[PDB]
């Protein structure tokens, strides 16, 4: 697959549609998320596309190379660490990220896994607390969706 | 992936959880669906895991070998043709299917695609009109979900 789509939904007001497109060796992630409190929000690909217990059964960040949590520009990061999205005053986060590590096929494929938008901003593993190196202290999962193959 | 899961949800009361497990060289589909009218309901894997327009954006039956619609035991069938699930008097359908054409990896992988439960019985491509050769006359999509990787 070369195109993917994710519909984020949660127990609250956060909702959004993310599109993924394979462009050479990068994946271009676009879309918008709304109902977010203005500010930065942790945006990551969790390991399982299991929504049987809402966003909790999505597990941890997709980390096939068992690295520490980082930000997207870092080398030592989880494959799912896409950093943060920023909600404007109206709660609207417009997504536009280009990542060279997540993929739509092969081993790092994220098809079938879950996109999660969090409550607080991802500290990018620079928080000086152990939690920071595991989840970036992004807190609760507001909305999530399974990533599926798109036309 | 050797395990997958799908949460079916729609606009009505139909809902359920379907689990998929690669056991040997085959795929075992289990789970239960509730909220259904008594009787048979078409149950198929649709091509796209695109829930942006509800179950409508799932596209047609997954059909990589370009065949016509059939029942699960037919040679001429789409890969996504899982036949009918049957709901009892309380609207509960118990799913137990072993299928030789779907898989959880490779060309016949259903990860990232959508599982749909339909309003009417699937006629297994034997109804005699053109629609029977496409969808089995199974009608509208009552509930659907993107198939994701499970732990
Ligand atoms: Ca929190
Ligand atoms: Ca119908
Ligand atoms: Cu996360
Ligand atoms: Cu169908
Ligand atoms: Zn991480
Ligand atoms: Zn079919």
Curated annotation (Swiss-Prot), chains A, B:
MF annotations from Gene Ontology: copper ion binding; protein homodimerization activity; protein phosphatase 2B binding; protein-folding chaperone binding; superoxide dismutase activity; ubiquitin-protein transferase activity; zinc ion binding
One Pfam family recorded for the sequence: Sod_Cu
Annotated catalysed reactions: 2 superoxide + 2 H(+) = H2O2 + O2
Chain sites annotated for binding Cu cation: 44, 46, 61, 118
Cofactor: Cu cation; Zn(2+)
Location relative to the cell: Cytoplasm; Nucleus
PTM description: Palmitoylation helps nuclear targeting and decreases catalytic activity.
GO CC list: cytoplasm; cytoplasmic vesicle; cytosol; dendrite cytoplasm; mitochondrion; neuronal cell body; nucleus; peroxisome
Domain of life of the organism encoding this protein: Eukaryota
Primary localization class, coarse: cytoplasm
Modified residues (N6-succinyllysine): 3, 9, 89, 120, 134
InterPro entries xref list: SOD-like_Cu/Zn_dom_sf (IPR036423), SOD_Cu/Zn_/chaperone (IPR024134), SOD_Cu/Zn_BS (IPR018152), SOD_Cu_Zn_dom (IPR001424)
Gene Ontology biological-process entries: auditory receptor cell stereocilium organization; embryo implantation; glutathione metabolic process; heart contraction; hydrogen peroxide biosynthetic process; intracellular iron ion homeostasis; locomotory behavior; muscle cell cellular homeostasis
Residues noted as binding Zn(2+) in the record, renumbered to the chain: 61, 69, 78, 81
Transferase listed as a keyword: no
Lipid-anchored residues (S-palmitoyl cysteine): 6
Cysteine-cysteine disulfides: 55-144
Modified residues (N-acetylalanine): 1
Similarity comment: family membership: Belongs to the Cu-Zn superoxide dismutase family.
Complex formation: Homodimer; non-disulfide-linked. Heterodimer with SOD1. The heterodimer CCS:SOD1 interacts with SLC31A1; this heterotrimer is Cu(1+)-mediated and its maintenance is regulated through SOD1 activation.
Function: Destroys radicals which are normally produced within the cells and which are toxic to biological systems.
Name the record gives this protein: Superoxide dismutase [Cu-Zn]
Phylogenetic classification of the source organism: Eukaryota, Metazoa, Chordata, Craniata, Vertebrata
């Amino acid at each position: 697959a070369t195109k993917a789509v994710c519909v984020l939904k949660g127990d609250g007001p956060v909702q959004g549609t993310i599109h993924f497109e394979a462009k050479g060796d990068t994946v271009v992630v676009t879309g918008s998320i709304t109902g977010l409190t203005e500010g930065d929000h942790g945006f990551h690909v969790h390991q399982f596309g299991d929504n049987t217990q809402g966003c909790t059964s999505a597990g941890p960040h997709f980390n096939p190379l068992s690295k520490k949590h980082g930000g997207p520009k870092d080398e030592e990061r989880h494959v799912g660490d896409l950093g943060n999205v920023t909600a404007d005053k109206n709660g609207v986060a417009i997504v536009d990220i280009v990542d060279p590590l997540i993929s739509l096929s092969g081993e790092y494929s994220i098809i079938g896994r879950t996109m999660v938008v969090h409550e607080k901003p991802d500290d990018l593993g620079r928080g000086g607390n152990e939690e920071s190196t595991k989840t970036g202290n992004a807190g609760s999962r507001l909305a999530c969706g399974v990533i599926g193959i798109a036309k």
